[PDB]
């Protein structure tokens, strides 16, 4: 049995301007098997209003999912993406960096 | 080599239950049951993919009930058999897409088992006139008054099955053709050289394998149980 | 342009939680247009592109039927696999399939595909000749031997050269304004001091379609493969793609470094230098 | 346009 | 939608080409089947074509396919009397490979043998007053009616190959239980 741990990117669809409607993206790729718990956070709180792409996979058979929500980024407010998978002993949080 | 079915021929009483087995080609995952009526293309009954019965026709009454308990041999059950269930029940197997068929189970539902008769057989010796005109000699074999229409006719000359100079009516022929229920006749022709027939040590036998009742079957009547049996008539060659 | 159709299916067993979950998705190039989820209430092949919504009722009834038949066959395939690998029926296992076809500019068949992965690794694949199978281990070459006896290749080859290119050509003509487009990457660099004497130079490609793109760093025109960071190409969520590539660079050496962008939607590849 | 006949492993 | 359509009957002369024609239901069907059935049971898979082939040949057999118009045809090169049978074209239906069948084309192969037509009387081997009549060696184009009064049974014609003399003949049998019954008038050919 192969297991691969997810690659995680949290990024905005558009360049962030403070106050401008935008989409927050957490992209999980390169993992196996397919069971995975993803949550987007605002200042630590799980965001209720969160969609995901349908389970697809890559030429190497590893799965990929897009999680997204619409949001208005502030100067102050702090977004992140919490991921768990059998490959992880505890959830991995990745803070959102406007610049990556 | 091919698909196998048991029994080749069944005759039950109307309102009784009946069961056929199908044994597919070894390790064929896909099994199909079809129904064929004389004069028609077979009609889908059901599909097994190993154990799983994945697709079933609306041509199945509740009475029809197929199993493939081990993804191996399949059984089809008809409860309370009716006249209209009379047909060929075909089994076929494939690994993917190439379906191979069995010899079928020919079912006849009749109102009463006393409707079931073995054939009477007789050989008719060739005409002097045909021997004059052609130097050939046609023997005719006639099998009469059998029900149902389940027979194999073959000729044996000096103990050998003959596979040339034979013709058997392709379809049994009704003694009263207007009716559903009616006994049957069948003729066959064996044509030999006038010299062959004229040798009196040459032995001609016409043979009719009847598929009738089982030993399991009940019989309260006086005449012989109309079992699965061979009935022969014979003629010796003649210098006359 | 040249184009592809890909159908992807994932079957995941879960002993003591009922029957395997089956999820299927369809793409033309990097644009999804259908899905089926065996846990959804609908029990239908659903549209996932506004442009496919134009197909008549026969299309949705039939596509639903076929993918449901697939779900049933891939359920049985999980079990056959369990037998081949001599594995307990307590474990969750994953069977994955991908089939589809490519066409060129003219609409002519180019390439077919038909491949499986068990528990995340190659099991069996149709070769590009479409006449035989690559088996990946002892279990797969039972399948390979069975499929060569059953002539599955020349039958699947009939589907890949027929119904599959017909489907693709019809989606290309009904989804024209979505699928027969290129969005070229919008490119810029960012300078990011790390120490008083270092910077990360980051090369950006935004809003591009399709997904395929090459981002390369050079130093005096030598490739920097070894010392470059490179993120997986990612979806923007709006049907475009993003990527970047970064090199850490000695303070003062910025103009020795160039970023090369190749993408189907660019007349010639881009060279970028830290100028701004 | 999906397949009409998936194979068994 | 629709059925698999083929003719019920086709008559050929021994040595002529037989073409058996078929329209099928779904253009997406990846394979099409010809099955053959001889007296008794036993559907024999005879030949098949995949939908990506125009043509396939196999000894005396040829299959031509037109996918767009859904036309399939079995062509037989050198029709023998031995080729007489029912031919069914069969198409996969839905998302297994359950077959739907045409109604069957019964193939009748007429011998090209010069007729010497004659009615003969035969006597029971077991010393009976019981007789059958034999209409043999008649022309393949003969309209051998079963026409009768209900006491008189007339069989259909059937072809008979004496291989050693390369000799094929048409014959029919008639019998009755009547005190009245003469072989002379028994037969009712309407030859065309």
Please summarize the sheet with the most strands of chain C.
8 strands, antiparallel
Number of domains of chain C: 2
Category from helices, strands and their pairing of chain D = little secondary structure
Structure class of chain C: alpha+beta
Largest sheet of chain D: none
Overall geometric form of chain C: globular
PDB class: immune system
Keywords: MHC Class I, A24, Diabetes related super antigen, 4C6 TCR, immune system
Assembly: pentameric
Entry title: Human MHC Class I, A24 Allele presenting LWM, Complex with 4C6 TCR
Keywords:
heteropentamer, B: 240 residues, mainly beta, 2 domains, 7-stranded mixed beta sheet, 5-stranded antiparallel beta sheet, 2 helices, 20 strands, 5% helix, D: 9 residues, little secondary structure, 0% helix, 0% strand, elongated, immune system, MHC Class I, Diabetes related super antigen, 4C6 TCR, pentameric
Describe what is shown at a glance.
The complex is a heteropentamer of chains A (100), B (240), C (276), D (9) and E (192). By secondary structure, chain A is mostly beta strands. Chain A is built from no helices and nine strands.
Describe this structure in words.
The complex is a heteropentamer of chains A (100), B (240), C (276), D (9) and E (192). Chain A has 100 residues and is mostly beta strands. Chain A has one domain. Helices cover 0% and strands 47% of the residues of chain A. In chain A, the strands form 2 sheets. In chain A, strands 1, 2, 5, 6 and 7 form a 5-stranded antiparallel beta sheet that branches. In chain B, a hairpin with a 2-residue loop joins β5 and β6 (52-56). Chain B starts with a strand and ends with a strand. In chain B, strands 2, 4, 5, 6, 9, 10 and 11 form a 7-stranded mixed beta sheet that branches. In chain B, strands 12, 13, 16, 17 and 18 form a 5-stranded antiparallel beta sheet that branches. Chain B has 2 helices and 20 strands. Chain D is elongated and about 20 Å long. The N and C termini of chain D lie far apart (22 Å). Chain E is built from 1 helix and 15 strands. With 192 residues, chain E is mainly β. Chain E is elongated, with a radius of gyration of 21 Å. Chain E folds into 2 domains: 5-110, Immunoglobulin-like, CATH 2.60.40.10; 118-185, Immunoglobulins (Immunoglobulin-like, Sandwich), CATH 2.60.40. β12 of chain B pairs antiparallel with β11 of chain E, so a sheet runs across the interface. It is classed as immune system. The entry lists the keywords MHC Class I, A24, Diabetes related super antigen, 4C6 TCR, immune system. The assembly is pentameric.
